[PDB]
C-alpha cells in the first residue's frame, strides 16, 4: 500500500507526474499533465512525493510503456520545498542504479534569484548521472514573466515528442475528462459537514494544540487602526490576540492568515450561475487508489466552498478556460474560450491581454461572456484552492508575547477590465472590526512560520536596518526588542534605521513610535528617505551611500549585521549595488572581490533578506 508501483500495477497506470508544490501551481500542473495523458491513449495520475519513497523508480521500468515526469520548484537559496526535501536528500544520499527508466523534468522558478530552477536542473543532472535516460529537454519555467506560457509551450512540444518516442496514437481530441464526481446529500447534520475548517472536523470550535498550517488558531483582533495620515492608500495595523494558544514565536518571523473570500463575490457568482448555494455535497475522485480524496475537504456546501475553500479572485489558468469552453452556447465565445489555451496565435495575445493583464476573475469572465452557464460543480472542480497569506511580525517575544502585530497595505486598484478589484486577505482583515464589548470577537485563524531573519545573539553587535514601505514591521520588532534589552540593564550597540516613504503627511509609518524610540536612545539614528516631497526622488540607497563613511567602519570593526526587507523588484538589487560600491571604494577592493566578500558575509548570516513581491 505504501509503495506506489504496486498501485500502478493494480490501477494499470503507467505515467506519473510528480510535483514539489507549496503554493499549488506545481500540483495543478502535475494534475493537468496526468489528465492530458488520457488524450494520447495512456493513463496515469499525479502523486505527491512525500508519502511515497523514491526507491520504487527501480520497479518503475517493470511497467510496459511507462514514464515519469517531475514538476518541481524551489525556495530560498535553491532549497527544496517541504514536500520535496525528502526527495532532495534521497537524491543526495542515493547510490543505486536506475537502468532503462524514462523520465522528464519541468522546472519552476524565478529569474530574479540566482538559483533559477536549481531543483529542476539538479534532478535532471542527478538522474542522468545515476544512469537514467532523458527524453525531453528541461523546461526553463520562469515566474518573472508568465509561467503558464512556458508550461503550455513545454507541454505542446513534449507530448508529440513522447508520442513519437513511444509510437502511440493521438486520434482522440477534446476529451476533457473529469477528475471528481458530484454526490448530493439531502439529510445530513452539520456535525459532520465542514463549515470552513481546514484540517480536522469541527476544528474551528474546540481547538487543541499545536497549531500550524494544517490546524490554524483563530486569534481575536484586539485593535486595529489606519496608520497613514493620507487617504489614497489604507496602511493598516493589526493586533491579534494569541492568549493561551501555546504559540511561541520570535521577532522577525512570519504570521500566516487563512482568509475568507468576499461574500458579495460568492453571492453574485451563485446568482449569475443560477444554483442553490446551500446544497450539501461532495466531490469524489474516480481513481479510488489516490490520496487526494476531494479537491477540498468534504462534505461541504457550495457557499462554504466558494467562500473558504476556493480562489475566485485571481485570473484562471488556460486549462480552466479550455474545460469551460464546451459550456458556451454561442459559437464565437466557445471558439474564443477554446483558442484561449493555445500556444501561439492571436488567441494567445488575447488571453494575455484579457485574463492576466486585465486581472479578470471567474465572475468577470462569466459576466463578460453571458452565453456561458457552466455547472457550479464543474467550476468548483476547476478552480484552485485558496492560499494562505503571510505577513511579517511587528511584535517581539521578549516583549508582549500574548499578541502578534501585522502591518499591511489594503489592496485596491482599478483593473483594466473596468471592475474594482479588491484583495482578499488585506480587505478581509480591514473589515475585521475590533469589536470586543460583550461577545463579538471577529476571530481570525492564523499560524506562525519560523525563519532565519533574527537579531544577533549578542546585544553588542550593531544592527543596520533598511526597508521602505511596510517593511518596517520586522524592523519595529527588532527596535522594541533592543529597547527592552536597553531597559533591562544590558547595553546595546548602535541601531540604525533606514526607512522610506512618499510624504511625511501621507504615509509616514508610526511617527510617534519612532519619535519616542529615538528620544529614548533605543533607535540610535533614524534615517527616513522622503520620496515625493522634494523636486527629485531620494531613496534609501542614497542615505546608505551618504552614511557610507560610518557604515564601512561599522561593518569592519563592529561586525554589524545587515537586514533588508520590502519589495524585491528594484529595492533589494539597488541596496546590494550600493553595498558593493561602499565596500569596494572604501577597501580599496575590486568588483569581483567585493561581491565575494558580500557573499561570504551572507554565508555567515550577517546579511539577511526578507523581501517579497
Ligand atoms: C514571505 C512574505 C512576507 C510578507 N510580508 C508581508 C508584510 O509584512 N506585510 C504585507 O502587507 N504583506 C506581506 N506579504 C504579502 C501578503 O502575503 C499578500 O501577498 C498581500 O497582502 C497581498 O494582499 P492579499 O493577501 O489580498 O492578496 P491578493 O488578493 O492575491 O492580491 C495580490 C495580487 O494582486 C495583484 N495586484 C495588487 N495590486 C495590483 C495593482 N495595482 N495592479 C495589478 N495587480 C495588482 C498582485 O500582483 C497579486 O497578484 C508577504 C508575503 C510573503 C510571501
Ligand atoms: C519565498 C519564495 C522563494 C523563492 N525562491 C526561489 C528560488 O530560490 N529559486 C527559484 O528558481 N525560484 C524561487 N521562487 C519562485 C518560485 O519557484 C515560483 O513562484 C514557483 O512558481 C512556485 O511554485 P509552487 O507554486 O509550486 O510553490 C521563490 C518564490 C518565493 C515566494
For residue 139, the domain's CATH number is 3.40.50.360
Same domain, 279 and 368: yes
Contact 517, 496 (CB under 8 A): no
The CA-CA-CA angle for residues 48, 52, 54, to 5°, reads 105
Whether 254 and 266 share a structural domain:
no
Residue 366 lies in a domain: yes
Distance 553 CA to ligand 2 centre (A): 36
Neighbours of 300 (CB within 10 A): 24
Question: 145 among the known binding-site residues?
Answer: no
Please name which of 18, 122, 123 lies closest in space to residue 71, comparing C-alpha atoms. 18
Longest dimension (CA), the chain: 79
User: What whole-number distance in Å separates Cα of residue 319 and Cα of residue 317?
Assistant: 5
Q: Are 580 and 598 in contact (CB under 8 A)?
A: yes
Question: Ligand 1 pocket by C-beta < 6 Å: which residues?
Answer: 254, 313, 359, 389-392, 407-409, 411, 413, 423-426, 470, 473, 612
Query: In terms of domains, do 242 and 287 share one?
Result: no
Ligand in nearest proximity to the CA of 75 = 2
Phi-psi region of 437 (alpha: psi -120 to 50; beta: other; left: phi over 0): left
Residues 6+ apart with CB under 8 A from 127: 98, 103, 105, 134
C-alpha 361/C-alpha 365 separation (Å) is: 6
Residue 113 CB less than 6 A away from ligand 2:
yes
Residues 6 or more apart whose Cβ sits within 8 Å of residue 172: 38, 39, 40, 41
Breaks in the chain, named by the residue before each, with C–N above 2.5 Å?
Answer: none
Alpha carbon dihedral 289, 51, 179, 190, in 10-degree steps, equals 90
369 and 272 fall within a common domain:
yes
Scanning the structure block, which residue is given the C-alpha cell 470550535? 205
How far is the C-alpha of 228 from the C-alpha of 238, rounded, in Å?
13
Nearest to 130 by CA among 100, 106, 104, 107: 100
The Cα-based distances of 582 to 461, 496, 551 in angstroms read: 20, 17, 8
Residue 350: CB atoms within 10 A of its CB come to: 14
Compute the distance between CA of residue 524 and CA of residue 115 in angstroms, rounded to an integer. 37
Nearest-angstrom CA–CA distance, 301 and 345: 40
Helices (H), 355-503: 362-368, 376-382, 425-430, 472-487
Probe ligand 2: pick from 32, 48, 74, max atoms within 8 Å of CB? Answer: 74
Which residue in the block uniquely carries the three cell numbers 536549481?
A: 118
Same domain, 286 and 362: yes
Mutation probe of ligand 1 site: the residue of 253, 313, 391 with most atoms within 8 A of C-beta: 391
- Residue whose grid cell is 522546472: 107
Q: To which H or E segment does residue 227 belong? A: none
Q: For ligand 2, say whether the CB of 117 is within 6 Å of any of its atoms.
A: yes
Residue appearing with cell numbers 480562489: 311
For residue 335, the tally of other CB atoms under 10 A from its CB is: 13
Domain residue limits at 331: 262-382
Spatial contact of 492 and 485, defined as CB atoms under 8 Å apart: yes
- The string over 371-384, giving b where at least 16 C-beta atoms fall within 10 Å of a residue's C-beta and e elsewhere, is ebebebbbbbbbbb
Q: Is residue 182 part of a domain?
A: no
- Rounded to the nearest angstrom, the distance between the alpha carbon of 155 and the centre of ligand 1 is 30
Helices (H), 68-206: 85-93, 118-130, 147-166
Q: Report the alpha-carbon distance of residue 442 to residue 238 in Å, rounded.
A: 12
Q: What is d(CA 133, CA 102) in angstroms, rounded to the nearest whole number?
A: 5
Contact 63, 50 (CB under 8 A): no
Tally Cβ neighbours within 10 Å of residue 603.
Answer: 10
Cell numbers found for residue 230: 493620507
Q: Looking at the domain assignment, is residue 190 inside a domain?
A: no
- C-alpha 80 – ligand 2 centre gap (Å): 10
- CA dist 64 and 97 (Å) reads 19
In-domain check, residue 498: yes
Asked whether residue 202 is assigned to any structural domain, the reply reads no
Q: Is 560 annotated as a binding residue?
A: no
**DSSP-derived 3-state class of residue 444:** strand
In the DSSP assignment, the letter for residue 197 is -
Backbone angles phi, psi at 501, to 5 degrees: -160, 165
Experimental method: cryo-EM
Q: Is residue 201 part of a domain?
A: no
Cell of residue 384, nine digits? 484552485
Residue 120: phi and psi, rounded to 5, are -60, -45
Residue linked to cell 475548517: 197
Does residue 245 have a known ligand-binding role?
no
Tell how far the Cα of 259 is from the centroid of ligand 1, in angstroms: 13
Q: Which residue's C-alpha comes closest to atom 7 of ligand 2?
A: 75
What separation in Å is there between the alpha carbon of 180 and the centre of ligand 1?
Answer: 31
The DSSP code sequence of 454-468 is ---SSTTS-EEEE--
Q: Look at residue 374 and tell me if it is in a domain.
A: yes
CA–CA dist 379, 402 (Å, integer): 41
Label the pairing between strands 180-182 and 283-285. Answer: antiparallel
Structural domain total, the chain: 4
Angle, helices 85-93 vs 118-130, to 10°: value is 30
Q: What is the number of the ligand 2 atom nearest to the C-alpha of 117?
A: 11
Closest of 318, 42, 346 to residue 153, by C-alpha: 318
257 backbone φψ class: left, alpha, beta (φ>0; ψ -120 to 50): beta
| Closest residue by CA, ligand 1 atom 49 | 314
Which of 166, 191, 212 represents a domain boundary (last residue)? 166
Strand partners, 390: 256
- CA-wise closest residue to 560 among 492, 480, 491: 492
Closest CA to 542 of 496, 578, 495: 578
**Position 178 in a domain:** no
Q: In terms of DSSP H, where are the helices of 216-317? A: 263-273, 302-308
Q: Is 59 helix (H, G, I), strand (E, B) or coil?
A: coil
Do 110 and 143 reside in the same domain of the chain? yes
Place of cell 505527491: 48
* Whether the CB of 5 sits within 6 Å of ligand 2: no
How many CB atoms are located within 10 Å of the residue 289 CB? Answer: 14
Length of the chain: 613
Q: Let me know: does 396 contact 417? Beta carbons within 8 Å.
A: no
Cα 101 from Cα 490, distance rounded (Å): 62
The annotation status of 332 as a binding-site residue, yes or no, is no
- What angle do the packed helices 331-339 and 318-325 form, to 10 degrees? 150
Task: Return d(Cα 409, Cα 392) in angstroms, integer.
Answer: 12
Among 360, 382, 404, give the residue marking a domain's end: 382
Catalytic positions: 392, 565, 610, 612
Q: What value does the CA radius of gyration of the chain take, rounded to a whole number of Å? A: 26
The DSSP secondary-structure symbol of 277 reads: T
Q: Is 23 in the pocket of ligand 2 (CB under 6 A)?
A: yes
The angstrom resolution of this structure is 3.3
Specify whether 231 is located in the same domain as 343.
Answer: no
Give the N- to C-terminal CA distance of the chain in Å, as an integer: 42
Domain termination site, one of 166, 185, 202: 166
Euclidean distance between CA atoms 146 and 383, whole angstroms: 19
Residues 24 and 145 in one domain: yes
Is 391 annotated as a binding-site member? Answer: yes
- Tally of CA atoms within 13 A in the half-sphere of 34 that contains its CB: 24
Separation CA 160–CA 141 (nearest Å): 19
Q: How far apart are CA 43 and CA 286, in angstroms?
A: 13
Verify that 278 and 246 share a domain, yes or no. Answer: no
- Please state, in angstroms and rounded to a whole number, the distance separating the CA atoms of residues 455 and 547: 22
User: Tell me, what CATH number does 409's domain have?
Assistant: 2.40.30.10
Angle value at C-alpha 377, between 374 and 380, nearest 5 degrees: 95
Among 195, 197, 185, which residue's Cα sits nearest to residue 281? 185
- Neighbouring residues of 317: CB distance < 8 A, sequence distance ≥ 6: 28, 148, 384
568 and 601 part of one domain: yes
Q: Angle at the Cα of 463 (from 410 to 486), degrees rounded to 5?
A: 95
Q: Which residue's CA is the closest to the ligand 2 atom numbered 10?
A: 109
Phi, psi for residue 324 in degrees, rounded to 5 = -95, -5
Question: Whose C-alpha lies nearest to ligand 2, atom 22?
Answer: 73
Of 85, 82, 136, 66, the closest CA to residue 107 belongs to 136
The answer to whether residues 151 and 272 belong to one domain is no
User: Please, are residues 539 and 578 in contact by the beta-carbon 8 Å criterion?
Assistant: no
User: Is 407 assigned to a binding site?
Assistant: yes
Among 352, 510, 574, 334, CA closest to 582:
574
Position in ligand 1 atom list of the atom nearest CA 389? 17
Handedness of CA 600, 603, 606, 611 (dihedral sign): positive
Same domain flag for 143 and 269? no
Amino acid at each position: 500500500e505504501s509503495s506506489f508501483v504496486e498501485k500502478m500495477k493494480k490501477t494499470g497506470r503507467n505515467i506519473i507526474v510528480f510535483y514539489g508544490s507549496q503554493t499549488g501551481t506545481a500540483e495543478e500542473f502535475a494534475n493537468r499533465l496526468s489528465k492530458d495523458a488520457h488524450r494520447y491513449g495512456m493513463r496515469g495520475m499525479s502523486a505527491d512525493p512525500e508519502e511515497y519513497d523514491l526507491a520504487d523508480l527501480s520497479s518503475l521500468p517493470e511497467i510496459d510503456k511507462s514514464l515519469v515526469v517531475f514538476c518541481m520548484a524551489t525556495y530560498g537559496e535553491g532549497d527544496p520545498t517541504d514536500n520535496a526535501q525528502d526527495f532532495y536528500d534521497w537524491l543526495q544520499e542515493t547510490d543505486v542504479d536506475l537502468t532503462g527508466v524514462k523520465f522528464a523534468v519541468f522546472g519552476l522558478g524565478n529569474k530574479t534569484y540566482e538559483h533559477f530552477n536549481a531543483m529542476g536542473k539538479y534532478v535532471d543532472q542527478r538522474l542522468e548521472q545515476l544512469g537514467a535516460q532523458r527524453i525531453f529537454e528541461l523546461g526553463l519555467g520562469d515566474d518573472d514573466g508568465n509561467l503558464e506560457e512556458d508550461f503550455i509551450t513545454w507541454r505542446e512540444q513534449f507530448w508529440p515528442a513522447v508520442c513519437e518516442f513511444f509510437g502511440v496514437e493521438a486520434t482522440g481530441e477534446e476529451s476533457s475528462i473529469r477528475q471528481y464526481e458530484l454526490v448530493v446529500h439531502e439529510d445530513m447534520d452539520v456535525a459532520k459537514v465542514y463549515t470552513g475548517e481546514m484540517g480536522r472536523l469541527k476544528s474551528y470550535e474546540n481547538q487543541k494544540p499545536p497549531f500550524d498550517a494544517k490546524n490554524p488558531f483563530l486569534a481575536a483582533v484586539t485593535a486595529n487602526r489606519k496608520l497613514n495620515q493620507g487617504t489614497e492608500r489604507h496602511l493598516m495595523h493589526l493586533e491579534l490576540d494569541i492568549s493561551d494558544s501555546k504559540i511561541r514565536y520570535e521577532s522577525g518571523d512570519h504570521v500566516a492568515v487563512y482568509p475568507a473570500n468576499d461574500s458579495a463575490l460568492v453571492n453574485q457568482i451563485g446568482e449569475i450561475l443560477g444554483a442553490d448555494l446551500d446544497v450539501i455535497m461532495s466531490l469524489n475522485n474516480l481513481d479510488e487508489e489516490s490520496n487526494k480524496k476531494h479537491p477540498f475537504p468534504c462534505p461541504t456546501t457550495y457557499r462554504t466552498a466558494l467562500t473558504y475553500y476556493l480562489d475566485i479572485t485571481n485570473p484562471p489558468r488556460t486549462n480552466v478556460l479550455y474545460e469551460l469552453a464546451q459550456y458556451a452556447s454561442e459559437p464565437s465565445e466557445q471558439e474564443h474560450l477554446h483558442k484561449m489555451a493555445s500556444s501561439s496565435g492571436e488567441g494567445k495575445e488575447l488571453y494575455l491581454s484579457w485574463v492576466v493583464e486585465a486581472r479578470r476573475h471567474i465572475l468577470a469572465i462569466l459576466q463578460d461572456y453571458p452565453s456561458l452557464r457552466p455547472p457550479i460543480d464543474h467550476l468548483c472542480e476547476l478552480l484552485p484552492r485558496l492560499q494562505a497569506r503571510y505577513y511579517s511580525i511587528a511584535s517581539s517575544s521578549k516583549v508582549h508575547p500574548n499578541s502578534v502585530h501585522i502591518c499591511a497595505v489594503a489592496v485596491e486598484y482599478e483593473a483594466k477590465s473596468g471592475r474594482v478589484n479588491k484583495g482578499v486577505a488585506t480587505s478581509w482583515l480591514r473589515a475585521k472590526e475590533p469589536a470586543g464589548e460583550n461577545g463579538g470577537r471577529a476571530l481570525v485563524p492564523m499560524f506562525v512560520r519560523k525563519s532565519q531573519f533574527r537579531l544577533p545573539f549578542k546585544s553588542t553587535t550593531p544592527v543596520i536596518m533598511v526597508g521602505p514601505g511596510t517593511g518596517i514591521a520586522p524592523f519595529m520588532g527588532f527596535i522594541q526588542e533592543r529597547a527592552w534589552l536597553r531597559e533591562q540593564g544590558k547595553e546595546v550597540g548602535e541601531t540604525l534605521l533606514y526607512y522610506g516613504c512618499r510624504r511625511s503627511d501621507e504615509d509616514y509609518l508610526y511617527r510617534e513610535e519612532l519619535a519616542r524610540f529615538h528620544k529614548d536612545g533605543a533607535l540610535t539614528q533614524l534615517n527616513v528617505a522622503f520620496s515625493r516631497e522634494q523636486a527629485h526622488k531620494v531613496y534609501v540607497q542614497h542615505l546608505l551611500k551618504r552614511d557610507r563613511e560610518h557604515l564601512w567602519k561599522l561593518i569592519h570593526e563592529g561586525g554589524a549585521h545587515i537586514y533588508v526587507c520590502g519589495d524585491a523588484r528594484n529595492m533589494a538589487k539597488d541596496v546590494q549595488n550600493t553595498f558593493y560600491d561602499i565596500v569596494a571604494e572604501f577597501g580599496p577592493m575590486e568588483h569581483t572581490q567585493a561581491v565575494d566578500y558580500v557573499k561570504k558575509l551572507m554565508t555567515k548570516g550577517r546579511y539577511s533578506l526578507d523581501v517579497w513581491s
